[PDB]
Design a protein around this ligand. Structure first.
Ligand SMILES: *[B]([O])([O])C1=[C]C([N]S(=O)(=O)C2=[C]C(S(=O)(=O)C3=[C][C]=[C][C]=[C]3)=[C]S2)=[C][C]=[C]1
Length: 358
């Protein structure tokens, strides 16, 4: 790595780990389409296992980007349409509040107030049906955005139905494999457990708990190497051989709604570059990120814009992640940590680094 990248990365990350008391962390900077790695501390404190380029971290909601791209791919294959009613793929969803709710609304959190979390009691398949049948929207479709696992997780579940494949089989066959993300998992296999870092919450070692729609909304675990490949693939979809995947990536990066200075794609969120740092830094704080906000439709949607700061934060009880990239600049960053620390601190560090590199 050029001394310049090494310099900004270490001068930015070192203080971060110290002030946030982060046990372990891995960072990847993609500069001119080439990846450079950095690792710090521990993946498992007790057994003194250091973080390495093979350490698996829980991505949390960064998993939503994979779900968005998998849905985009399904659209490109002509298996589903974002214009399709939710009921077309789940006829059992007969309650009338579901009438004007399309796959687009589910994918972009604009269905009308679906909750950030699926209740813990909802476990079985019929459990899930009852939950959505009983849900009472607080707003009409397409008027308010409320970041929700129950919205995009359902989008992910329905989107793979015409394929005949299970969500994880679809994700493996159509996204991970074609992209060579060979150490990216929804269920980590026994043989790879040795690379699975522990997350830390108040000194306690923890891992994400299973839950309804978890694979779709926050269940991916991955390495800093696989994540840098994910960033490269999203920075340059044109150089992806599988046609429907290249398209799916562009569809996930298209602008569907605008809220403040942000635009909602499928999983990914974007802003026009150059961007005002405080706009992305303050916007990443949950007081704003998780708040209900009115949206303006982009009719029709704007196709992926090269000059964008495309990003997504992610967290589990024990991990904190962040991905951001500027296509026009062939520049990107991945930050994986085994401690959930505040989003603003993550975006500011990413900003400090990327602004320095170009
Ligand atoms: B996503 O990372 O934005 C996301 C994921 C989940 N589900 S989960 O099991 O990963 C959990 C994440 C947390 S948390 O990050 O402490 C939290 C975030 C926001 C609101 C409450 C808790 C707990 S379980 C849920 C929400 C967002």
């Amino acid at each position: 790595a050029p001394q310049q990248i090494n310099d900004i990365v270490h001068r930015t990350i070192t203080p971060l780990i110290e002030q946030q008391k982060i046990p372990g962390m891995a960072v990847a900077v993609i500069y001119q389409g080439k990846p450079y790695y950095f690792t710090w501390g521990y993946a498992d404190i007790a057994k003194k296992q250091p973080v390495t380029q093979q350490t698996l971290f829980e991505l949390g909601s960064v998993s939503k980007t994979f779900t968005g791209v998998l849905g985009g791919d399904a659209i490109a294959r002509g298996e589903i349409k974002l214009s399709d009613p939710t009921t077309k793929y789940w006829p059992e969803l007969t309650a009338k509040q579901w009438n004007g709710i399309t796959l687009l609304h589910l994918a972009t959190y604009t269905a009308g107030g679906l909750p950030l979390q699926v209740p813990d009691e909802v476990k079985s398949s019929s459990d899930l049906l009852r939950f959505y049948q009983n849900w009472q929207p607080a707003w009409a479709p397409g008027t308010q955005r409320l970041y929700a696992n129950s919205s995009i997780g359902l989008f992910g579940a329905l989107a793979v139905k015409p394929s005949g494949l299970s969500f994880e089989q679809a994700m493996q066959t159509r996204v991970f494999q074609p992209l060579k993300l060979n150490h990216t998992w929804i269920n980590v296999p026994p043989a790879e457990e040795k690379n699975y870092a522990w997350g830390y919450r108040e000194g306690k070692a923890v891992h994400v708990s299973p839950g309804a729609l978890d694979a779709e909304a926050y269940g991916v675990k991955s390495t800093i190497e696989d994540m840098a490949r994910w960033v490269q693939s999203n920075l340059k979809p044109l150089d992806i051989n599988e046609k429907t995947l290249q398209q799916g990536i562009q569809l996930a990066q298209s602008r569907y709604w605008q809220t403040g200075d942000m635009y909602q794609g499928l999983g990914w969120e974007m802003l026009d570059w150059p961007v005002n740092p405080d706009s992305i830094i303050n916007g990443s704080d949950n007081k704003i990120a998780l708040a209900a906000r009115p949206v303006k439709a982009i009719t029709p949607p704007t196709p992926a814009v090269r000059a964008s700061w495309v990003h997504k934060t992610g967290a589990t009880g024990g991990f904190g992640s962040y991905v951001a990239f500027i296509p026009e600049k062939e520049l990107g960053i991945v930050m994986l940590a085994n401690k959930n620390y505040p989003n603003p601190a993550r975006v500011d560090a990413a900003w400090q680094i990327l602004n320095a590199l170009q």
